């Protein structure tokens, strides 16, 4: 329980059997197609290629460097005070700020806004409150 403070996001992976029947059909069809096989931005299926994605990450890291807007900063103060006076810490606040900057980096933005802050808050709640509910 000590080192859980050092991690920004936590998930618990966890009744699949009916949905897992469709997943079993898809996965075993993939493996039989792999057996049959045994016998440049986009892939054929519309997903991004690895050779483009790796280069794009290496480009973005050396060039973007965003900041928050003041209106984006105003929401977090109220959210912090409300959660703390209805385990809330400055570590969690700075983690949320880092996630909002990270989302704004992918769009190659000059600034992060209320949109990126709200998606960061949704991701933080969905990840972290599983540990509060479980164990």
């Amino acid at each position: 329980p000590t080192i859980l403070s050092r991690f920004d996001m936590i998930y618990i992976v966890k009744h699949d059997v009916l949905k897992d029947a469709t997943l079993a059909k898809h996965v075993i069809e993939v493996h039989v197609n792999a057996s049959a096989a045994k016998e440049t931005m986009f892939d054929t299926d519309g997903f991004l290629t690895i050779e483009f994605l790796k280069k794009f990450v290496t480009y973005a890291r050396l060039n973007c460097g965003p900041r928050l807007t003041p209106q984006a900063s105003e929401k977090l103060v109220n959210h912090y005070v409300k959660m703390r006076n209805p385990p809330i810490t400055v570590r969690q606040l700075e983690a949320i700020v880092r996630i909002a900057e990270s989302i704004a980096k992918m769009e190659l933005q000059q600034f992060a806004t209320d949109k990126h802050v709200e998606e960061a808050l949704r991701l933080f709640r969905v990840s972290t409150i599983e540990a509060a509910a479980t164990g």
């Binding site: 000590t2 403070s5 890291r61 050396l62 060039n63 973007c64 460097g65 900041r67 928050l68 003041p70 900063s73 977090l76 103060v77 912090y80 005070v81 703390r84 006076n85 809330i88 810490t89 400055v90 570590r91 606040l93 700075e94 700020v97 000059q110 600034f111």
Partner: protein
């Protein structure tokens, strides 16, 4: 041959005219006068300054370095002979170089055989060292059979002089009379070798780092130890080898050193001294320094005052019978998680010269003090002598390791008596420590001593103890969150939005949060603390009376009156803490005397540390 002699005469004359010009524009004659007054025997020159007046000498001094350097040292000897000061030193006078190298700035990886015979400048980390040893240069002998005196000179491949001789030690006269050595007249020199490796920031990934061997003599010996980051100037050269008249063609190469530069602190000018006078003459310099210490951390004002007192320090007293009284100050922080304990430790590690950081998680007491490895091996608190040790996660240390510190924190000594080893070691240093409470989080229903959970003999050795609590309170939560977001939205005034990191007062202060009151620059803080550390104040009668009354009041105060609870033990060491804090406060004023104005501030800080109101969960 005679043309070579004429050219050498011309080159020596050119260097002599440069050194002993009638009105010296580069002041090397005055530097020679300084050298002979100080008793030193080598002169440092700027190759960039030789490059302006004699470029045909300067660029030839890189390619044909040996002959040019020999001519330059001969010219230096003639320039010394023109003085009215006498040549005391029996070894000759020498030259070192500095300046711009360009092509010949290299690494151990890029030193290759194209550079042999050239002057070079190289960088790296010292990885080995020989002990200093003495080497014969000339020998003087007396012949008792004839009353004559014989002399002989010696030379070696590692010397810059290319000349070689028989190198047999003389024992008999030409008439086969025996001889007697004159040890008081024979000449020896100090000698050392070492090696340098590539810097880890430059060595390519996966491969092993490459390395180069080095030879140093005379005043250049005994200057380095393993781990030093250095820049070294010398001639790159090759050494032949023989075994029974058969030679392998693979020869060894070295650097023969001329000059060494250390890469791993203060600086002053009279404008800076004027500004130090002005700020010392201002109204409240101690409060100004305490506010200016660490601006990007909100709150913690009393702890910042304590850290400033730690950086200044008290006065050691050594009495007439050899008895010693301690001068250093020791500080402990205990508190809830995410309250910037480790952040303040890292800041003090930046500010203090001679500082070391460790953790209690991965430290043995033997490694923390001294070790037997048979040999004796220094630990962290010995290495930080007359300095600062920062210890993080201090609650995670074992008590077997903690009991090894008790001698160091009071007597300033480490004593060992184990198999074959009996020794004292000096370990005079200041301890700054951070910890979490017993339960991992402060329990308000138990007393502060119960939450701290350490014995009185260890708790008494800390001058100041701070308990830091993370209380939920909407006003403080709003203020702290606003400060943190204001520090995160900041960007420098002369910077574009897309960029990435790969005078006296501060001017932009939105990041600092403090709205209007001024803040000093960190460089000015470093200079001011460096000067104020050397002030040596004395005590006075008003201070003595105030301290003596106040100590008795602190001991006799009873806590059942006020619904407070005691945070520290109170012993006779806390009286000395009052004396130390008074002298440390008086240093910041640049005062020669300790007064009631100092002692009142020291009492207020100590009384803040000693007592704490009960938590709101219990109230």
């Amino acid at each position: 041959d005679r043309a070579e002699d004429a050219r050498k005469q011309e080159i020596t004359e050119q260097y002599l005219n440069f050194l002993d010009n009638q009105a010296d524009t580069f002041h090397y004659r005055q530097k020679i006068v300084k050298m002979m007054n100080d008793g030193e025997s080598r002169l440092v020159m700027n190759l960039d300054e030789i490059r302006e007046i004699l470029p045909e000498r300067a660029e030839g001094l890189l390619t044909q370095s040996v002959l040019e350097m020999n001519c330059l040292q001969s010219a230096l000897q003639m320039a010394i002979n023109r003085s009215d000061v006498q040549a005391v030193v029996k070894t000759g006078f020498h030259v070192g170089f500095e300046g711009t190298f360009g092509e010949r700035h290299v690494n151990p990886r890029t030193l290759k055989s194209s550079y042999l015979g050239n002057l070079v400048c190289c960088e790296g980390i010292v990885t080995k060292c020989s002990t200093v040893r003495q080497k014969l240069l000339t020998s003087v002998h007396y012949c008792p059979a004839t009353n004559k005196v014989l002399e002989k000179k010696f030379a070696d491949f590692t010397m810059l002089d290319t000349a070689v001789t028989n190198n047999n030690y003389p024992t008999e006269d030409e008439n086969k009379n025996p001889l007697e050595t004159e040890f008081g007249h024979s000449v020896y020199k100090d000698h050392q070798t070492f090696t340098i490796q590539e810097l880890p920031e430059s060595a390519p990934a996966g491969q092993l780092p490459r390395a180069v061997d080095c030879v140093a003599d005379l005043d250049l010996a005994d200057r380095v130890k393993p781990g030093d980051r250095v820049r070294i100037i010398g001639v790159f050269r090759v050494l032949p080898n023989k075994q029974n008249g058969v030679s392998s063609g693979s020869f060894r190469s070295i650097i023969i050193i001329n000059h060494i530069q250390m890469l791993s602190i203060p600086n002053f000018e009279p404008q800076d001294v004027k500004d130090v006078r002005k700020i010392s003459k201002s109204r409240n310099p101690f409060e100004l320094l305490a506010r200016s210490l660490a601006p990007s951390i909100c709150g913690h004002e009393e702890t910042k005052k304590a850290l400033l007192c730690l950086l200044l320090g008290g006065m050691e007293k050594i009495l007439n019978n050899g008895s010693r009284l301690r001068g250093d100050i020791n500080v402990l922080l205990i508190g809830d998680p995410s309250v910037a304990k480790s952040q303040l430790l890292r800041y003090v590690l930046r500010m203090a010269p001679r500082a070391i950081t460790t953790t209690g998680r991965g430290s043995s007491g033997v490694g923390l003090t001294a070790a037997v490895t048979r040999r004796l091996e220094a630990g962290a608190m010995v290495l930080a002598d007359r300095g600062v040790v920062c210890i993080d996660e201090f609650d995670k240390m074992s008590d077997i390791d903690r009991t090894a510190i008790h001698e160091v924190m009071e007597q300033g000594r480490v004593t060992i008596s184990k198999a074959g080893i009996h020794a004292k070691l000096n370990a005079r240093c200041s301890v700054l420590a951070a910890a979490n409470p017993v339960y991992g989080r402060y329990n308000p229903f138990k007393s502060p001593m119960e939450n701290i959970g350490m014995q009185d003999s260890l708790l008494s050795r800390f001058d100041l103890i701070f308990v830091l609590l993370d209380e939920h309170d909407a006003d403080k939560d709003a203020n702290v969150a606003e400060h943190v977001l204001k520090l995160h939205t900041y960007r420098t005034q002369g910077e574009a939005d897309g960029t990435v990191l790969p005078s006296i007062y501060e001017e932009n202060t939105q990041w600092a949060g403090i709205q209007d009151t001024k803040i000093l620059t960190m460089d000015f803080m470093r200079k001011y603390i460096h000067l104020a550390r050397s002030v040596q104040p004395k005590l006075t009668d008003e201070a003595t009376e105030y301290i003596s009354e106040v100590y008795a009041d602190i001991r006799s105060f009873d806590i059942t009156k006020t619904d407070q609870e005691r945070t520290m033990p109170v012993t006779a060491r806390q009286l000395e803490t009052l004396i130390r804090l008074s002298t440390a406060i008086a240093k910041a004023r640049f005062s020669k005397k300790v007064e009631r104005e100092d002692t009142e501030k020291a009492y207020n800080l100590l009384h803040f540390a000693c007592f704490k109101e009960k938590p709101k969960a219990r109230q």
